[PDB]
Design a protein around this nucleic acid. Structure first.
Ligand SMILES: Nc1ncnc2c1ncn2[C@@H]1O[C@H](CSCC[C@H](N)C(=O)O)[C@@H](O)[C@H]1O
Ligand SMILES: Nc1ncnc2c1ncn2[C@@H]1O[C@H](CSCC[C@H](N)C(=O)O)[C@@H](O)[C@H]1O
Lengths: 246, 244
DNA sequence: TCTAGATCTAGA
DNA sequence: TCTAGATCTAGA
Protein backbone atom coordinates (compact mmCIF):
# COMPACT_ATOMS: atom_id res chain seq x y z
CA UNK A 1 0.00 0.00 0.00
CA UNK A 2 1.21 3.46 -1.01
CA UNK A 3 0.39 6.41 1.18
CA UNK A 4 -0.77 9.78 -0.24
CA UNK A 5 1.71 12.62 0.53
CA UNK A 6 -1.12 14.84 1.87
CA UNK A 7 -3.19 14.20 5.06
CA UNK A 8 -6.82 14.59 3.92
CA UNK A 9 -10.35 14.57 5.38
CA UNK A 10 -12.16 11.71 3.65
CA UNK A 11 -8.92 9.84 2.80
CA UNK A 12 -9.70 6.31 1.60
CA UNK A 13 -6.47 4.50 2.49
CA UNK A 14 -8.34 2.33 5.03
CA UNK A 15 -10.97 1.35 2.42
CA UNK A 16 -8.64 0.51 -0.47
CA UNK A 17 -9.17 -3.24 -0.26
CA UNK A 18 -12.98 -2.79 -0.44
CA UNK A 19 -12.78 -0.22 -3.24
CA UNK A 20 -10.46 -2.34 -5.38
CA UNK A 21 -12.69 -5.34 -4.82
CA UNK A 22 -15.54 -3.56 -6.61
CA UNK A 23 -13.65 -1.31 -9.04
CA UNK A 24 -13.99 -2.63 -12.64
CA UNK A 25 -11.05 -2.82 -15.02
CA UNK A 26 -10.38 -0.45 -17.89
CA UNK A 27 -7.67 1.54 -19.62
CA UNK A 28 -8.42 4.74 -17.73
CA UNK A 29 -9.61 5.67 -14.28
CA UNK A 30 -11.43 8.97 -13.90
CA UNK A 31 -11.55 10.42 -10.34
CA UNK A 32 -13.83 13.51 -10.24
CA UNK A 33 -13.02 14.07 -6.52
CA UNK A 34 -9.32 13.05 -6.45
CA UNK A 35 -8.54 14.66 -3.10
CA UNK A 36 -5.24 13.20 -1.78
CA UNK A 37 -5.29 10.49 -4.45
CA UNK A 38 -5.13 7.27 -2.48
CA UNK A 39 -7.05 5.35 -5.12
CA UNK A 40 -4.90 6.68 -7.98
CA UNK A 41 -1.82 5.74 -5.94
CA UNK A 42 -2.95 2.19 -5.24
CA UNK A 43 -4.31 1.04 -8.61
CA UNK A 44 -2.63 0.10 -11.89
CA UNK A 45 -4.56 1.79 -14.69
CA UNK A 46 -2.64 2.66 -17.89
CA UNK A 47 -3.73 6.31 -17.53
CA UNK A 48 -5.73 8.56 -15.16
CA UNK A 49 -7.89 11.70 -15.43
CA UNK A 50 -7.74 13.20 -11.95
CA UNK A 51 -9.86 16.19 -11.07
CA UNK A 52 -10.96 18.24 -8.09
CA UNK A 53 -12.59 21.62 -7.48
CA UNK A 54 -9.66 22.68 -5.26
CA UNK A 55 -7.37 24.80 -7.46
CA UNK A 56 -4.49 24.90 -4.98
CA UNK A 57 -4.52 21.09 -4.96
CA UNK A 58 -4.51 20.67 -8.74
CA UNK A 59 -1.80 23.32 -9.20
CA UNK A 60 0.30 21.52 -6.57
CA UNK A 61 -0.14 18.17 -8.37
CA UNK A 62 0.99 19.54 -11.72
CA UNK A 63 4.09 21.04 -10.07
CA UNK A 64 4.91 17.74 -8.34
CA UNK A 65 4.38 16.00 -11.69
CA UNK A 66 6.58 18.37 -13.74
CA UNK A 67 9.16 19.81 -11.31
CA UNK A 68 9.63 17.05 -8.77
CA UNK A 69 13.20 17.70 -7.72
CA UNK A 70 12.78 21.46 -7.36
CA UNK A 71 9.61 20.94 -5.36
CA UNK A 72 10.93 18.32 -2.97
CA UNK A 73 14.00 20.49 -2.29
CA UNK A 74 12.00 23.62 -1.54
CA UNK A 75 9.41 21.81 0.56
CA UNK A 76 11.98 19.86 2.57
CA UNK A 77 13.47 23.09 3.90
CA UNK A 78 10.25 23.92 5.73
CA UNK A 79 10.18 20.61 7.59
CA UNK A 80 12.75 21.52 10.20
CA UNK A 81 12.48 22.13 13.96
CA UNK A 82 12.79 25.88 13.34
CA UNK A 83 9.42 26.13 11.61
CA UNK A 84 7.52 24.20 14.24
CA UNK A 85 5.98 26.98 16.28
CA UNK A 86 2.89 29.15 16.21
CA UNK A 87 4.65 32.43 15.31
CA UNK A 88 6.32 30.88 12.26
CA UNK A 89 3.24 28.88 11.22
CA UNK A 90 1.00 31.98 11.17
CA UNK A 91 3.55 34.03 9.25
CA UNK A 92 3.73 31.24 6.62
CA UNK A 93 -0.08 31.02 6.54
CA UNK A 94 -0.12 34.76 5.80
CA UNK A 95 2.70 34.42 3.23
CA UNK A 96 0.60 31.72 1.52
CA UNK A 97 -2.54 33.84 1.44
CA UNK A 98 -0.73 36.87 0.01
CA UNK A 99 1.26 35.00 -2.63
CA UNK A 100 0.04 34.61 -6.22
CA UNK A 101 2.97 32.40 -7.17
CA UNK A 102 2.01 28.82 -8.09
CA UNK A 103 5.34 27.29 -6.96
CA UNK A 104 5.58 29.04 -3.58
CA UNK A 105 1.91 28.40 -2.86
CA UNK A 106 2.40 24.70 -3.61
CA UNK A 107 5.42 24.46 -1.34
CA UNK A 108 3.58 26.21 1.50
CA UNK A 109 0.45 24.11 0.89
CA UNK A 110 2.32 20.94 2.04
CA UNK A 111 3.78 22.73 5.07
CA UNK A 112 0.33 23.95 6.13
CA UNK A 113 -1.21 20.56 5.47
CA UNK A 114 1.18 18.88 7.90
CA UNK A 115 1.84 21.57 10.53
CA UNK A 116 -1.75 22.75 10.62
CA UNK A 117 -4.61 21.48 12.76
CA UNK A 118 -5.56 17.90 11.94
CA UNK A 119 -4.53 18.20 8.35
CA UNK A 120 -7.57 20.34 7.53
CA UNK A 121 -7.71 22.31 4.28
CA UNK A 122 -10.18 25.15 4.82
CA UNK A 123 -10.65 28.64 3.37
CA UNK A 124 -12.95 31.55 4.20
CA UNK A 125 -15.18 33.23 1.60
CA UNK A 126 -12.35 35.58 0.59
CA UNK A 127 -10.32 32.54 -0.47
CA UNK A 128 -7.92 32.70 2.50
CA UNK A 129 -6.64 29.48 4.12
CA UNK A 130 -7.61 29.73 7.79
CA UNK A 131 -6.61 26.51 9.54
CA UNK A 132 -4.81 27.11 12.88
CA UNK A 133 -1.50 25.66 14.15
CA UNK A 134 -1.55 21.92 14.83
CA UNK A 135 1.16 21.68 17.52
CA UNK A 136 2.70 18.37 16.36
CA UNK A 137 5.91 16.96 17.89
CA UNK A 138 7.43 16.44 14.42
CA UNK A 139 5.39 16.51 11.22
CA UNK A 140 6.42 13.73 8.83
CA UNK A 141 8.02 14.97 5.55
CA UNK A 142 6.53 12.69 2.85
CA UNK A 143 9.61 12.44 0.64
CA UNK A 144 9.05 8.87 -0.59
CA UNK A 145 5.35 9.54 -1.17
CA UNK A 146 6.13 12.65 -3.24
CA UNK A 147 8.46 10.74 -5.54
CA UNK A 148 6.03 7.86 -5.95
CA UNK A 149 3.22 10.36 -6.69
CA UNK A 150 5.35 12.08 -9.37
CA UNK A 151 6.22 8.72 -10.94
CA UNK A 152 2.58 7.62 -11.12
CA UNK A 153 1.64 11.11 -12.30
CA UNK A 154 3.52 10.60 -15.59
CA UNK A 155 0.44 8.73 -16.82
CA UNK A 156 -2.07 11.23 -15.40
CA UNK A 157 -3.61 14.53 -16.32
CA UNK A 158 -4.92 16.80 -13.56
CA UNK A 159 -7.92 19.09 -14.05
CA UNK A 160 -9.37 21.78 -11.81
CA UNK A 161 -13.07 21.43 -12.60
CA UNK A 162 -16.32 20.38 -10.96
CA UNK A 163 -17.48 16.74 -11.17
CA UNK A 164 -19.98 17.15 -14.02
CA UNK A 165 -17.13 18.37 -16.21
CA UNK A 166 -14.55 15.68 -15.49
CA UNK A 167 -17.15 12.91 -15.74
CA UNK A 168 -18.05 14.18 -19.23
CA UNK A 169 -14.44 13.20 -20.12
CA UNK A 170 -15.06 9.49 -19.52
CA UNK A 171 -15.36 7.31 -22.62
CA UNK A 172 -15.63 3.63 -23.70
CA UNK A 173 -12.40 2.57 -22.00
CA UNK A 174 -12.97 4.48 -18.76
CA UNK A 175 -13.94 3.44 -15.26
CA UNK A 176 -15.15 6.23 -12.98
CA UNK A 177 -14.53 6.32 -9.24
CA UNK A 178 -16.38 9.02 -7.26
CA UNK A 179 -15.60 9.94 -3.66
CA UNK A 180 -17.75 13.03 -3.04
CA UNK A 181 -17.70 14.94 0.28
CA UNK A 182 -19.62 12.74 2.77
CA UNK A 183 -23.41 13.00 3.00
CA UNK A 184 -25.00 14.19 6.30
CA UNK A 185 -24.89 11.45 8.94
CA UNK A 186 -23.01 28.08 1.36
CA UNK A 187 -19.88 27.32 -0.61
CA UNK A 188 -19.83 23.54 -0.31
CA UNK A 189 -21.16 20.25 -1.73
CA UNK A 190 -24.97 20.27 -1.56
CA UNK A 191 -27.59 17.54 -1.31
CA UNK A 192 -28.67 18.53 -4.81
CA UNK A 193 -25.18 17.96 -6.17
CA UNK A 194 -25.13 14.63 -4.29
CA UNK A 195 -28.31 13.64 -6.14
CA UNK A 196 -27.06 15.06 -9.44
CA UNK A 197 -23.85 12.98 -9.12
CA UNK A 198 -25.98 9.82 -9.00
CA UNK A 199 -27.88 11.06 -12.05
CA UNK A 200 -24.69 11.50 -14.11
CA UNK A 201 -23.62 8.00 -13.03
CA UNK A 202 -26.87 6.52 -14.29
CA UNK A 203 -26.20 8.33 -17.57
CA UNK A 204 -22.68 6.94 -17.87
CA UNK A 205 -23.58 3.30 -17.20
CA UNK A 206 -26.41 3.58 -19.77
CA UNK A 207 -23.48 4.30 -22.13
CA UNK A 208 -21.56 1.30 -20.81
CA UNK A 209 -19.15 3.23 -18.62
CA UNK A 210 -18.97 1.71 -15.10
CA UNK A 211 -19.11 3.99 -12.08
CA UNK A 212 -18.32 3.21 -8.43
CA UNK A 213 -19.31 5.73 -5.77
CA UNK A 214 -18.28 5.77 -2.09
CA UNK A 215 -20.30 7.54 0.62
CA UNK A 216 -21.74 6.93 4.08
CA UNK A 217 -24.55 4.36 4.33
CA UNK A 218 -27.62 6.48 5.13
CA UNK A 219 -31.29 6.46 4.15
CA UNK A 220 -30.50 9.30 1.70
CA UNK A 221 -27.54 7.69 -0.06
CA UNK A 222 -29.58 4.49 -0.25
CA UNK A 223 -32.17 6.54 -2.13
CA UNK A 224 -29.74 8.48 -4.35
CA UNK A 225 -27.98 5.26 -5.39
CA UNK A 226 -31.19 3.23 -5.81
CA UNK A 227 -30.16 2.19 -9.32
CA UNK A 228 -26.77 0.78 -8.25
CA UNK A 229 -25.68 -2.50 -6.68
CA UNK A 230 -24.93 -1.54 -3.08
CA UNK A 231 -22.16 -3.00 -0.99
CA UNK A 232 -21.91 -2.19 2.71
CA UNK A 233 -18.52 -1.83 4.38
CA UNK A 234 -18.78 -2.23 8.16
CA UNK A 235 -17.00 0.53 10.11
CA UNK A 236 -20.45 5.79 13.70
CA UNK A 237 -22.00 4.76 10.38
CA UNK A 238 -21.03 2.11 7.85
CA UNK A 239 -19.53 2.91 4.46
CA UNK A 240 -21.38 2.26 1.21
CA UNK A 241 -20.01 1.45 -2.26
CA UNK A 242 -22.53 1.94 -5.02
CA UNK A 243 -21.57 0.16 -8.21
CA UNK A 244 -23.18 1.08 -11.55
CA UNK A 245 -22.11 -1.76 -13.82
CA UNK A 246 -23.06 -1.93 -17.55
CA UNK B 1 -11.53 26.84 33.48
CA UNK B 2 -15.31 26.96 33.71
CA UNK B 3 -17.43 28.05 30.77
CA UNK B 4 -20.42 30.40 31.11
CA UNK B 5 -23.69 28.69 30.10
CA UNK B 6 -24.65 31.58 27.76
CA UNK B 7 -22.82 32.55 24.51
CA UNK B 8 -22.19 36.29 24.84
CA UNK B 9 -20.75 39.16 22.83
CA UNK B 10 -17.84 40.47 24.85
CA UNK B 11 -17.34 37.23 26.80
CA UNK B 12 -13.97 37.21 28.61
CA UNK B 13 -13.18 33.50 28.78
CA UNK B 14 -10.09 33.98 26.53
CA UNK B 15 -8.86 36.80 28.80
CA UNK B 16 -9.31 35.13 32.18
CA UNK B 17 -5.62 34.57 32.85
CA UNK B 18 -4.85 38.25 32.19
CA UNK B 19 -7.77 39.49 34.27
CA UNK B 20 -6.93 37.32 37.25
CA UNK B 21 -3.30 38.38 37.10
CA UNK B 22 -4.38 41.95 37.80
CA UNK B 23 -7.51 41.45 39.92
CA UNK B 24 -6.83 42.24 43.63
CA UNK B 25 -8.02 40.00 46.44
CA UNK B 26 -10.94 40.73 48.72
CA UNK B 27 -14.03 39.25 50.35
CA UNK B 28 -16.42 40.38 47.65
CA UNK B 29 -16.24 40.87 43.91
CA UNK B 30 -18.63 43.40 42.40
CA UNK B 31 -19.33 43.05 38.63
CA UNK B 32 -21.45 45.99 37.36
CA UNK B 33 -21.51 44.50 33.81
CA UNK B 34 -21.79 40.78 34.68
CA UNK B 35 -22.88 39.63 31.25
CA UNK B 36 -22.46 35.84 30.90
CA UNK B 37 -20.37 35.86 34.07
CA UNK B 38 -17.07 34.27 33.04
CA UNK B 39 -15.10 36.19 35.69
CA UNK B 40 -17.55 35.29 38.46
CA UNK B 41 -17.36 31.65 37.35
CA UNK B 42 -13.58 31.48 37.33
CA UNK B 43 -12.66 33.28 40.56
CA UNK B 44 -13.11 32.29 44.20
CA UNK B 45 -14.36 35.26 46.19
CA UNK B 46 -16.33 34.48 49.35
CA UNK B 47 -19.27 36.44 47.90
CA UNK B 48 -20.36 38.32 44.76
CA UNK B 49 -22.57 41.24 43.82
CA UNK B 50 -23.42 40.72 40.15
CA UNK B 51 -25.37 43.34 38.23
CA UNK B 52 -26.38 44.13 34.66
CA UNK B 53 -28.89 46.44 32.97
CA UNK B 54 -30.44 43.47 31.11
CA UNK B 55 -33.53 42.47 33.10
CA UNK B 56 -34.10 39.16 31.31
CA UNK B 57 -30.53 38.13 32.15
CA UNK B 58 -30.86 38.99 35.85
CA UNK B 59 -34.26 37.31 36.09
CA UNK B 60 -32.78 34.20 34.44
CA UNK B 61 -29.85 34.09 36.89
CA UNK B 62 -32.15 34.30 39.90
CA UNK B 63 -34.23 31.40 38.55
CA UNK B 64 -31.11 29.36 37.88
CA UNK B 65 -29.91 30.16 41.41
CA UNK B 66 -33.20 29.26 43.16
CA UNK B 67 -34.92 26.64 40.95
CA UNK B 68 -32.03 24.81 39.32
CA UNK B 69 -33.61 21.39 38.73
CA UNK B 70 -36.93 22.74 37.43
CA UNK B 71 -35.11 25.11 35.10
CA UNK B 72 -32.67 22.55 33.68
CA UNK B 73 -35.51 20.06 33.06
CA UNK B 74 -37.62 22.62 31.26
CA UNK B 75 -34.75 24.05 29.24
CA UNK B 76 -33.47 20.63 28.24
CA UNK B 77 -36.73 19.86 26.44
CA UNK B 78 -36.08 22.64 23.93
CA UNK B 79 -32.65 21.28 22.96
CA UNK B 80 -33.88 18.51 20.70
CA UNK B 81 -33.75 18.06 16.91
CA UNK B 82 -37.40 18.97 16.57
CA UNK B 83 -36.88 22.58 17.61
CA UNK B 84 -33.97 23.18 15.24
CA UNK B 85 -35.68 24.85 12.31
CA UNK B 86 -36.72 28.34 11.31
CA UNK B 87 -40.46 27.76 11.71
CA UNK B 88 -40.12 26.59 15.30
CA UNK B 89 -37.44 29.17 16.20
CA UNK B 90 -39.62 32.12 15.11
CA UNK B 91 -42.67 30.77 16.90
CA UNK B 92 -40.62 30.46 20.12
CA UNK B 93 -39.24 33.97 19.57
CA UNK B 94 -42.79 35.31 19.37
CA UNK B 95 -43.82 33.19 22.38
CA UNK B 96 -40.97 34.78 24.32
CA UNK B 97 -41.93 38.28 23.26
CA UNK B 98 -45.59 37.83 24.22
CA UNK B 99 -44.93 36.12 27.57
CA UNK B 100 -44.83 37.98 30.89
CA UNK B 101 -43.86 34.88 32.89
CA UNK B 102 -40.35 35.00 34.40
CA UNK B 103 -39.85 31.23 34.32
CA UNK B 104 -40.98 30.64 30.71
CA UNK B 105 -39.06 33.68 29.46
CA UNK B 106 -35.93 32.44 31.27
CA UNK B 107 -36.26 29.01 29.68
CA UNK B 108 -36.79 30.48 26.21
CA UNK B 109 -33.94 32.95 26.74
CA UNK B 110 -31.39 30.05 26.76
CA UNK B 111 -32.99 28.47 23.68
CA UNK B 112 -32.83 31.76 21.77
CA UNK B 113 -29.26 32.38 22.94
CA UNK B 114 -28.05 29.10 21.43
CA UNK B 115 -30.33 28.62 18.41
CA UNK B 116 -30.24 32.27 17.40
CA UNK B 117 -27.73 34.08 15.19
CA UNK B 118 -24.25 34.02 16.76
CA UNK B 119 -25.45 34.18 20.34
CA UNK B 120 -26.68 37.73 19.90
CA UNK B 121 -29.03 39.22 22.48
CA UNK B 122 -30.75 42.17 20.80
CA UNK B 123 -34.09 43.94 21.27
CA UNK B 124 -35.93 46.68 19.37
CA UNK B 125 -37.25 49.84 21.05
CA UNK B 126 -40.50 48.09 21.95
CA UNK B 127 -38.52 45.64 24.08
CA UNK B 128 -38.93 42.72 21.64
CA UNK B 129 -36.08 40.23 21.06
CA UNK B 130 -35.32 40.32 17.34
CA UNK B 131 -32.35 38.04 16.68
CA UNK B 132 -32.89 35.76 13.62
CA UNK B 133 -32.39 31.98 13.39
CA UNK B 134 -28.76 30.83 13.60
CA UNK B 135 -28.97 27.55 11.62
CA UNK B 136 -26.63 25.48 13.79
CA UNK B 137 -26.13 21.76 13.23
CA UNK B 138 -26.70 20.98 16.94
CA UNK B 139 -26.67 23.71 19.61
CA UNK B 140 -24.85 22.59 22.76
CA UNK B 141 -27.11 22.29 25.87
CA UNK B 142 -24.97 23.66 28.75
CA UNK B 143 -26.19 21.30 31.47
CA UNK B 144 -22.89 21.07 33.37
CA UNK B 145 -22.39 24.83 33.13
CA UNK B 146 -25.88 25.50 34.50
CA UNK B 147 -25.28 23.39 37.58
CA UNK B 148 -21.89 24.95 38.20
CA UNK B 149 -23.38 28.43 37.80
CA UNK B 150 -26.15 27.56 40.29
CA UNK B 151 -23.62 26.20 42.77
CA UNK B 152 -21.46 29.34 42.59
CA UNK B 153 -24.60 31.48 42.69
CA UNK B 154 -25.30 30.35 46.25
CA UNK B 155 -22.85 33.05 47.35
CA UNK B 156 -24.07 35.76 44.97
CA UNK B 157 -26.82 38.32 44.74
CA UNK B 158 -28.00 39.46 41.30
CA UNK B 159 -29.28 42.98 40.66
CA UNK B 160 -30.83 44.58 37.60
CA UNK B 161 -29.49 48.14 37.79
CA UNK B 162 -27.12 50.43 35.93
CA UNK B 163 -23.40 50.54 36.77
CA UNK B 164 -23.45 53.68 38.91
CA UNK B 165 -25.91 51.97 41.21
CA UNK B 166 -24.16 48.64 41.65
CA UNK B 167 -20.74 50.27 42.13
CA UNK B 168 -22.29 52.31 44.98
CA UNK B 169 -22.72 48.92 46.74
CA UNK B 170 -18.98 48.32 47.00
CA UNK B 171 -17.42 48.77 50.43
CA UNK B 172 -14.11 48.24 52.32
CA UNK B 173 -13.92 44.54 51.52
CA UNK B 174 -14.94 44.82 47.87
CA UNK B 175 -13.00 44.55 44.62
CA UNK B 176 -14.80 45.86 41.54
CA UNK B 177 -14.34 44.38 38.06
CA UNK B 178 -15.88 46.38 35.20
CA UNK B 179 -16.33 45.11 31.66
CA UNK B 180 -18.40 47.78 29.92
CA UNK B 181 -19.62 47.46 26.31
CA UNK B 182 -16.49 47.99 24.15
CA UNK B 183 -15.36 51.52 23.28
CA UNK B 184 -15.53 52.52 19.57
CA UNK B 185 -12.55 50.98 17.76
CA UNK B 186 -30.53 53.73 24.57
CA UNK B 187 -27.02 52.26 24.28
CA UNK B 188 -23.75 52.73 26.22
CA UNK B 189 -22.51 56.26 25.49
CA UNK B 190 -19.03 57.74 25.42
CA UNK B 191 -20.23 59.89 28.32
CA UNK B 192 -21.14 56.82 30.36
CA UNK B 193 -17.74 55.39 29.39
CA UNK B 194 -16.08 58.49 30.85
CA UNK B 195 -18.45 58.53 33.82
CA UNK B 196 -17.49 54.92 34.60
CA UNK B 197 -13.83 55.97 34.97
CA UNK B 198 -14.88 58.88 37.19
CA UNK B 199 -16.65 56.48 39.57
CA UNK B 200 -13.59 54.23 39.60
CA UNK B 201 -11.44 57.18 40.62
CA UNK B 202 -13.88 57.88 43.45
CA UNK B 203 -13.81 54.27 44.63
CA UNK B 204 -10.02 53.95 44.74
CA UNK B 205 -9.82 57.29 46.62
CA UNK B 206 -11.84 55.31 49.19
CA UNK B 207 -9.43 52.37 49.11
CA UNK B 208 -11.63 50.12 46.96
CA UNK B 209 -9.66 48.69 44.00
CA UNK B 210 -11.20 48.66 40.54
CA UNK B 211 -10.09 46.84 37.39
CA UNK B 212 -11.64 47.86 34.07
CA UNK B 213 -11.25 46.01 30.78
CA UNK B 214 -11.82 47.65 27.38
CA UNK B 215 -10.17 47.98 23.96
CA UNK B 216 -6.84 49.80 23.88
CA UNK B 217 -7.63 53.05 22.01
CA UNK B 218 -6.63 56.69 22.34
CA UNK B 219 -10.02 57.36 24.00
CA UNK B 220 -9.70 54.65 26.62
CA UNK B 221 -6.13 55.73 27.38
CA UNK B 222 -7.59 59.16 28.14
CA UNK B 223 -10.55 57.93 30.19
CA UNK B 224 -8.32 55.65 32.28
CA UNK B 225 -5.46 58.18 32.64
CA UNK B 226 -5.53 57.81 36.43
CA UNK B 227 -5.00 54.04 36.31
CA UNK B 228 -2.05 51.66 35.90
CA UNK B 229 -2.49 50.34 32.34
CA UNK B 230 -1.70 46.84 31.11
CA UNK B 231 -1.87 45.88 27.45
CA UNK B 232 -2.93 42.38 26.44
CA UNK B 233 -2.02 40.86 23.05
CA UNK B 234 -8.13 43.49 15.85
CA UNK B 235 -7.05 45.98 18.53
CA UNK B 236 -5.21 45.10 21.74
CA UNK B 237 -7.11 44.82 25.00
CA UNK B 238 -6.43 47.19 27.89
CA UNK B 239 -6.78 46.40 31.62
CA UNK B 240 -6.89 49.56 33.72
CA UNK B 241 -6.15 48.97 37.38
CA UNK B 242 -7.08 51.57 40.02
CA UNK B 243 -5.24 50.29 43.09
CA UNK B 244 -5.34 52.01 46.52
C1' DT C 1 -15.77 17.84 14.16
C1' DC C 2 -17.07 21.11 17.75
C1' DT C 3 -17.77 25.66 19.50
C1' DA C 4 -18.06 30.78 20.89
C1' DG C 5 -19.18 34.90 18.96
C1' DA C 6 -15.43 42.80 18.98
C1' DT C 7 -20.45 42.97 12.40
C1' DC C 8 -22.50 44.24 8.19
C1' DT C 9 -26.21 45.76 5.29
C1' DA C 10 -30.61 47.18 2.75
C1' DG C 11 -34.40 49.77 3.44
C1' DA C 12 -43.01 48.93 2.10
C1' DT D 1 -32.69 56.71 13.95
C1' DC D 2 -33.85 51.91 13.71
C1' DT D 3 -35.20 47.14 12.31
C1' DA D 4 -34.06 42.70 11.67
C1' DG D 5 -31.89 39.05 8.52
C1' DA D 6 -27.42 36.96 7.83
C1' DT D 7 -26.42 29.62 5.20
C1' DC D 8 -19.58 32.49 8.77
C1' DT D 9 -14.88 32.80 10.98
C1' DA D 10 -11.25 30.62 12.89
C1' DG D 11 -9.10 28.36 17.13
C1' DA D 12 -8.90 23.71 19.14
N1 LIG E 1 -18.04 20.16 -6.98
C1 LIG E 1 -16.91 19.45 -6.80
N2 LIG E 1 -16.26 18.89 -7.87
C2 LIG E 1 -15.11 18.17 -7.75
N3 LIG E 1 -14.48 17.94 -6.56
C3 LIG E 1 -15.12 18.48 -5.49
C4 LIG E 1 -16.28 19.22 -5.52
N4 LIG E 1 -16.64 19.62 -4.22
C5 LIG E 1 -15.72 19.12 -3.45
N5 LIG E 1 -14.73 18.40 -4.12
C6 LIG E 1 -13.64 17.74 -3.70
O1 LIG E 1 -14.09 16.51 -3.08
C7 LIG E 1 -12.95 15.86 -2.49
C8 LIG E 1 -13.57 14.82 -1.45
S1 LIG E 1 -12.29 13.96 -0.58
C9 LIG E 1 -11.80 12.67 -1.79
C10 LIG E 1 -10.60 11.95 -1.18
C11 LIG E 1 -9.93 10.86 -1.95
N6 LIG E 1 -10.77 9.66 -2.37
C12 LIG E 1 -8.71 10.28 -1.12
O2 LIG E 1 -8.63 9.05 -0.94
O3 LIG E 1 -7.86 11.15 -0.69
C13 LIG E 1 -12.16 17.01 -1.90
O4 LIG E 1 -10.76 16.91 -2.25
C14 LIG E 1 -12.88 18.28 -2.48
O5 LIG E 1 -11.98 19.31 -2.78
N1 LIG F 1 -25.56 50.99 31.89
C1 LIG F 1 -25.26 49.69 32.09
N2 LIG F 1 -25.13 49.19 33.35
C2 LIG F 1 -24.84 47.88 33.62
N3 LIG F 1 -24.62 46.93 32.64
C3 LIG F 1 -24.74 47.42 31.38
C4 LIG F 1 -25.04 48.73 31.03
N4 LIG F 1 -25.08 48.86 29.62
C5 LIG F 1 -24.79 47.67 29.18
N5 LIG F 1 -24.57 46.72 30.16
C6 LIG F 1 -24.24 45.40 30.13
O1 LIG F 1 -22.82 45.29 29.82
C7 LIG F 1 -22.51 43.90 29.60
C8 LIG F 1 -21.16 43.96 28.74
S1 LIG F 1 -20.61 42.33 28.31
C9 LIG F 1 -19.70 41.82 29.82
C10 LIG F 1 -19.35 40.35 29.64
C11 LIG F 1 -18.73 39.62 30.79
N6 LIG F 1 -17.43 40.18 31.34
C12 LIG F 1 -18.46 38.11 30.39
O2 LIG F 1 -17.32 37.64 30.54
O3 LIG F 1 -19.46 37.46 29.92
C13 LIG F 1 -23.72 43.36 28.89
O4 LIG F 1 -24.20 42.14 29.49
C14 LIG F 1 -24.75 44.55 28.96
O5 LIG F 1 -26.07 44.09 29.14
Amino acid sequence: KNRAFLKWAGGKYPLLDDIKRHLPKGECLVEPFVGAGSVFLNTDFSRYILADINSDLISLYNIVKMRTDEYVQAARELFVPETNCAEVYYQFREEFNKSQDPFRRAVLFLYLNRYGYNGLCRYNLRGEFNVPFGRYKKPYFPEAELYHFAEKAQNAFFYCESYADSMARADDSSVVYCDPPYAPLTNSFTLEQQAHLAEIAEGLVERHIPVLISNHDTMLTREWYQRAKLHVVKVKVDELLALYKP
